[PDB]
Amino acid sequence: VFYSFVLVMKPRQRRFTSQALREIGVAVYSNGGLIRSITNEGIMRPYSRFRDADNTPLTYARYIILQLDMGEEEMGKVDKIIREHQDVLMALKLNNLERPVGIRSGNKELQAAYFPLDTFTRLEEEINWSPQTSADIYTQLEMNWKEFSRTRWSSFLRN
Amino acid sequence: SNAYAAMELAAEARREIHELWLSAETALEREKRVQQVAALIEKYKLDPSTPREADVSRGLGDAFDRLLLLCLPLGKTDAKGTDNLERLMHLAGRNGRELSVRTIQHLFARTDSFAEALAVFYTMRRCHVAMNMEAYYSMLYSLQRLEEEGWGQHFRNEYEENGAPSEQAMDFIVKGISNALLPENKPWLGRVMFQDRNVPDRRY
Amino acid sequence: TLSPERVALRDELARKSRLVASEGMRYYNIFWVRKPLDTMEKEYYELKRRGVDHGEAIRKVLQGFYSGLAV
Amino acid sequence: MYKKALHSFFLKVHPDFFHHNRSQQTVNESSVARLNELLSWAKAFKSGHLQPPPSSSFTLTFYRKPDTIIQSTFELPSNFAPSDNHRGTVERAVNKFLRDLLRRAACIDSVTESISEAEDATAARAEAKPLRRRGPKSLLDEAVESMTVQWSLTPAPTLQELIEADQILFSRDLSPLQSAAALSTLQRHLGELNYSAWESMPVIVSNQFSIGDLTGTITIPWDFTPEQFHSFMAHNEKGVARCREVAIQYASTIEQLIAELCTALELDDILVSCSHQDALRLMELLHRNRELLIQYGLSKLTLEVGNRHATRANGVVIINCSLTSEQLRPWLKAISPKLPLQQRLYELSKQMLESTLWHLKEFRTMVEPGGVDAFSNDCTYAERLQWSKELFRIGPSLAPWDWSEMTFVLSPDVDIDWANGLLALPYNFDGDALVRYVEEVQQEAKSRKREELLAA
Amino acid sequence: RAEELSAKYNVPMAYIDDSSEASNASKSLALVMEDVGLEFTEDGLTVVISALSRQGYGTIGRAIFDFASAMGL
Amino acid sequence: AMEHPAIWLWYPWRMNPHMPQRRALKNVHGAVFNDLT
Secondary structure, X not given: OOEEEEEEEOOOOHHHHHHHHHHHHHHHHHOOOEEEEEEEEEXXXXXXXXXXXXXXEOOOEEEEEEEEEOOHHHHHHHHHHHHOOOOEEEEEXXXXXXXXXXXXXXXXXXXXXXXXHHHHOOXXXXXXXXXXXXXXXXXXXXXXXXXXXXXXXXXXXXX | OHHHHHHHHHHHHHHHHHHHHHHOOOOOOHHHHHHHHHHHHHXXXXXXXXXXXXXXOOOOOOHHHHHHOOOOOOOOOOOOHHHHHHHHHHHHHHHOOEEOHHHHHHHOOOOOOHHHXXXXXXXXXXXXXXXXXXXXXXXXXXHHHHHHHHHHHHHHHXXXXXXXXXXXXXXXXXXXXXXXXXXXOOOOOOOOOOOOOOOOOOOO | OOOHHHHHHXXXXXXXXXXXXXXXXXXXXOOOOXXXXXXXXXXXXXXXXXXXXXXXXXXXXXXXXXXXXXX | OOXXXXXXXXXXXXXXXXOOOHHHHXXXXXXXXXXXXXXXXXXXXXXXXXXXXXXXXEEEEEEOOOOOEEEEEEOOOOOOOOOHHHOOOOHHHHHHHHHHHHHHOOOOOHHHHHHHHHHHHHHHHHHHOOXXXXXXXXXXXXHHHHHHHOOOOOOOOOHHHHHOOOOEOOOOOOOHHHHHHHHHHHHOOOOOOOOOHHHXXXXXXXXXXXXXXXXXXXXXXXXXOHHHHHHHHOOOHXXXXXXXXXXHHHHHHHHHHHHHHXXXXXXXXXXXXXXXXXHHHHHHHHHHXXXXXXXXXXXXXXXXXXXXXXXXXXXXXXXXXXOOOXXXXXXXXXXXXXXXXXXXXXXXHHHHHHHHHHHHHHHHHHOOOOOEEOOOOXXXXXXHHHHHHHHHHOOOOOOOOOOOOOEEEEOOOOEEEOOOOEEEEOOOOOHHHHHHHHHHHXXXXXXXXXXXXXXX | OHHHHHHHOOOOHHXXXXXXXXXHHHHHHHHHHHHXXXXXXXXXXXXXXXXXXXXXOXXXXXXXXXXXXXXXX | OOOOOEEOOXXXXXXXOOHHHHHHHHHHHHXXXXXXX
């Protein structure tokens, strides 16, 4: 992934959030960029209540992961569009996607010994792992799991 | 019993390929040899349009490399020997196996002329097969040695009728081929590449 | 000690057999697993004699191991 | 040197590859065991302590695969002694034997056996005229390593792993302690005499001497000498081979019909609760009338095979064993509207089972207890899911205390045992009250420690 | 066939018997060197050449050295 | 095609003792990249 954003948005109506995401995608595509992915993560209750433009503390918020491939000047344009949006309370810019964290400030001998195509070609869920994600889930995809998981409920149906 | 029956005829596929390879008769006619390997392709369905789950060629292993150099040299008049080579190389490029250095050195050793070796080069370029960097350098050295013997037959064809060599024939003896990957006027272009520190020299 | 290529092979085979035995078959009372695991090893060496592939040999070995566990 | 040769030899004649023939497999097992003890006393002779061999001259037989019977004799010199000057000529003897197994196997070069014959000739010439001298492994030293680290047979299972294997059976009609005398003193120090090829056979303890009444087991009565069992297995080895072969064939002909019914009807698994000899007729009847099952709405549903025609609430239906072809069509027309209800109940049951297994896994990872059992009591899946989610909700609150000695179990009544490891909870329990109870227990412990420190 | 047999399997030329005059010469030399306690190896011929050289015999030890170096040792 | 001649004596210490090319290639790869700042 070239760039990723975690958009925290106000839980408005469906049409307002749809228009906000549509304007964000239009600003991405008009500057000559590509959307790798956009995923909605539902409404969760954060540990800190963000304030909107009219200084109202919001208890709930919607999280959206946005993975993009854009040029850096155009990414600055889209970031200035996103950070000045009325519905976006907070959005961090994941700029450590091509190079992993700890290489630049870590060991000096282990600085040019990495491969950027290892991290650039995979998605953001394969770089920053979720708690439900693990290596055995990745090995299950290449092991022909359809012919093996058909017998996993043969003991629980009778009890 | 799908996987057991797939390896039942595959062990028979490795056996009957080894039957006509154990012959290895150079006195056998090439027209009688390219019809036997063409019958073996249509028998075991070696076309890459076969479904890959019931593919019998992935179970051949090292016997597939002996089948690849079995269709060489090809027929020049019928121009159908390339079809026996292209069906095996499109399948080899689909399965993604590397041809070894000993295989390609034995593949271009069975090539008679310079025109047939360019057919093998542009078939494996079209079929997108993988190999080692030594396998590419030993291939282009065989293309270098096949053009050199082609001019040696030409400059002796004019020597037998004229009785004396020309100045261009004697200049071919000293210089030889100018444009070459591994020319003889700089004998150090195969030391880093090859593990044996020596260019393989074939004789007839 | 153990040979390191055999170490990597046993690591891959154990990681791929633990998922088919635990989550796949849901069979925890399996007896004498060393004989099918060494049969997996010896079938892998039988397929590496002819030198077919790497992943496809693991596929056929896991299919034979699944059939043996079903039997 | 001899690593590739012995590797290919043990790749050829190993008994784990011979599964089509059991007699070839057990002869290869006996030959591998004889070769292993042969190389064992050869290394013992090379070490310094000399023991008499179990056989001075014997013919060893292996089987080969064509992808073929290899017989070779081992002979000893007639002047054999445990003295030091015979420790060398036996080293040239077994090295004469092993290449005799390697020449007939056609897996080595003749240059390699010429090298070994030249090495034995140098040793024989240097044994006469004494010399002096001041390292690669030989054929024996590479053979023992290639035997032990790669091609060793799997060891025989012990009695403790045979207890939990459901392989040790006994008829209780004799007595409990008759079976205990048949087990304790006849399996601990008598298991060494039992063969390695015997270890696949389950053992029932019954009245008579026979080779099986069930599918693929063998019987043995009240207390026996191991020579009697050795003569018993040497008397009817063909029957105990054929019973294992017909048991494997029976399991395979069950599993192939199960696999074709799973792939054709797009279901998960075929369940059976009756005798398989009567279930095979129903399975082949479903195999013949497979397109009639495709024509009806019988798909994506597990099928149980019982004795009563009934339908379980979690989505699985029960089909009787005794069923004819002319009775199959009214039976299919009887339960035809009930099939999508069974489908939606099966999907709901799978979703609830996945949810409660995820909640129990998160409870096991968060609080790390001694064990969780929610599948004990026959309850609905809603009660088990509610119990698992209520335990998952109070997971972080029980986190400052370790519960590695106690068992969380589902019960119809509250039971909090602290002297034992028991915490039995109903499906509808207030987790906040349980947190208050453990907080009051900690308050009791803290007040007891404070009063103990104030008393001293 | 002994010249490529010595090159393929890393065996010296004196250790291969092809019923030659050189093979019979190496057999007679090894049969004599077994009687004095040596082994007909790289280290035995060093003792042979040194024991000849300490008693004169420069050309004889040089001829034995040349026959040893020609026959693979 | 021909049968090999018989080997009449052999010692295991002869078998006791491309690799300079591998060591030089490793030293070249070290001096090109690995031994740098």
